[PDB]
Amino acid sequence: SLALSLTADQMVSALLDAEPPILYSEYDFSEASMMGLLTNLADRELVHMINWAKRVPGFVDLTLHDQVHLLECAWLEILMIGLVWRSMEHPGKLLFAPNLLLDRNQGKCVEGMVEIFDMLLATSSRFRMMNLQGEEFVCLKSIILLNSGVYTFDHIHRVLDKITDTLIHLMAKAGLTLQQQHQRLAQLLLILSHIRHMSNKGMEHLYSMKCKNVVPLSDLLLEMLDAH
Amino acid sequence: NSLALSLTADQMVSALLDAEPPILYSEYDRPFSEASMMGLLTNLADRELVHMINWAKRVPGFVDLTLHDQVHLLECAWLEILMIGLVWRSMEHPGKLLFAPNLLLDRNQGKCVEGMVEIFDMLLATSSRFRMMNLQGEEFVCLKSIILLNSGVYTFKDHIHRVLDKITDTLIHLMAKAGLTLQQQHQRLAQLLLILSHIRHMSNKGMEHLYSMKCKNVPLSDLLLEMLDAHR
Amino acid sequence: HKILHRLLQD
Amino acid sequence: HKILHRLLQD
Ligand SMILES: CCOC(=O)[C@@H]1[C@H](C(=O)OCC)[C@H]2O[C@@H]1C(c1ccc(O)cc1)=C2c1ccc(O)cc1
Ligand SMILES: CCOC(=O)[C@@H]1[C@H](C(=O)OCC)[C@H]2O[C@@H]1C(c1ccc(O)cc1)=C2c1ccc(O)cc1
After folding, report:
1. How are beta strands A100-103 and B103-106 bridged, if at all?
2. Any signal peptide, and if so, which residues (chain B)?
3. B53 Cα to chain C: minimum distance (Å)
4. Which element (helix H / strand E) includes A220?
């Protein structure tokens, strides 16, 4: 276990090194034109998420069917947490891509969407409130990948422990009091439950979209959705 | 305000231990159809809900909130709370869910109802986890009350977050008392809160199947139809 | 007047 | 033959 013997400091750097790139929308509005852009975008992000996941410590140890399960479980949660991250310094807006910045009422296009919109904006606001750091974020994102599919199956937990240690050392380094440390850690883990909820709602409106034939989904996306 | 946010960690544990609802029995008799089993679960759950409402009111801080916020938190949290409760009391019955003392379901009774088995396993996975960490009655009630306070907080603010910090301190007081080193306190708390996501996931799934059951059509209670119509 | 309303009031 | 296998395998 190479990932088990990393310092907090070299854990944070790997995660940082492995951050996926920001992609552009193929943007040039309708329920269909919205879901197209979003589908096209998601579809290309997934490809990089897979690369990123492969660079997450401990992940590459697991078997292939294990890594598969973890990804088909986590994928929309991972996209959404990346969306909220990207969207932080745009109050009231969601930045899908540098060239694709939506405000809430571009949502009303797609019954299903304003509800989730608002869930994501509240999370965005929350992350801004606590002033999430990029270092804490890459940790958050890895917990999500490693936790989200863990029980729907020891090493994973070992890894999740390191990630917790990392998280705490960053808070100590930021100057947080020991009491502040565990309250912050906690309120961040508490947000994961909101991300999961948001992902479950999104997965479901997505499935109704596939069924109403609003847009064609990519083959990778059919496989992902199918898993749920 | 107060007054919650002035409790010692030890009297917070006690307030919550004192408010714990009893474990309710099933009306159960008579071989099982999908109909019989589901009318049983809905009878039990309906009655559990009434205790939960009253129990919520004893969660220190809950009653300071506005009635409409009380309604929202409970409307978000209800099936998570029942799940965490099922999981916790099923803890000493590996492979088995203890719905009630006289209603213990095994993996394969799950199959009567469509897509109930998948949830069944999810709860089993969670039960196994609680067991493998040895969740403690006192940790359990902090968790149960985090659920209530957390589930619908980001779908609305600062009173809820103060209480939550109180519950976390409490959780940590507990682990410091069990003599866990600081590092393993922070690890345990993390392991406990990550489970909450699995609970949300299961609630979300159970919810959508409940929704499809109401179409399929056992009659649901009025209280139960209302709780359910909040997620549609 | 949700049934939940009444139960929480009393 | 699922795409997810393929993309992970490299
Ligand atoms: C207001 C949130 O807006 C969304 O699109 C969410 C979901 C959604 O609204 O779908 C129907 C209501 C969905 O999950 C989100 C989403 C998405 C798409 C791209 C991305 O980088 C992050 C998220 C989604 C998405 C959309 C199309 C896809 O093909 C795949 C994912
Ligand atoms: C093994 C999974 O067992 C279940 O019944 C889950 C769900 C289910 O099986 O399929 C329908 C969702 C459901 O959510 C769970 C559940 C439930 C019912 C009573 C209870 O005390 C705890 C949970 C449920 C339940 C069933 C009827 C009700 O009226 C309310 C909740």
Report:
1. unpaired
2. none
3. 6
4. helix A219-227
Domain ranges of chain A: 1-228
What is the Cα B108 distance to its own chain's centre? 23
Experimental method: X-ray
Exposure class string for B22-50: b at 16+ Cβ within 10 A, else e: eeeebeeeeeeeeeebbebbbbbbebbbe
Q: Exposure pattern of A197-210 as b/e (b: 16+ CB <10 Å)?
A: bbbbbbbbbbeebb
Alpha helices in A110-154 (DSSP H): 113-129, 134-147
Query: At the topology level of CATH, where does A1-228 sit?
Result: Retinoid X Receptor (1.10.565)
Cβ-contact B120, B43 below 8 angstroms: no
3-class DSSP state for residue A167? helix
Tokens (6 digits) for D10: 């490299």
Place of tokens 């660079």: A55
Residues B109/B41, Cβ–Cβ less than 8 Å: no
Q: Is D8 on the interface with A (CB under 8 A)?
A: yes
CATH 1.10.760.10 fits B1-232, yes or no: no
Flag whether residue A54 sits within 8 Å of chain D, measured between CB atoms: yes
Which contacts of A65-70 are long-range, i.e. CB under 8 A and separated by 24 or more positions? Answer: A66/A153, A67/D8, A68/D4, A68/D5, A68/D8, A69/A149, A69/A152, A69/A153, A70/A145, A70/A146, A70/A148, A70/A149, A70/A150
Q: Is B138 annotated as a binding residue?
A: no
Distance (angstroms) between ligand 2 centre and the Cα of B99 equals 9
Q: Determine the Cα–Cα distance for residues B53 and B58; give it in Å rounded to an integer.
A: 9
Cβ-defined contact of B193 to A197 (cutoff 8 Å) = no
Q: Is the CB of A170 under 6 A from ligand 1?
A: no
**Per-residue three-class SS string for A12-56:** HHHHHHHCCCCCCCCCCCCHHHHHHHHHHHHHHHHHHHHHHHHHC
Whether B165 and B89 have beta carbons less than 8 Å apart is answered as: no
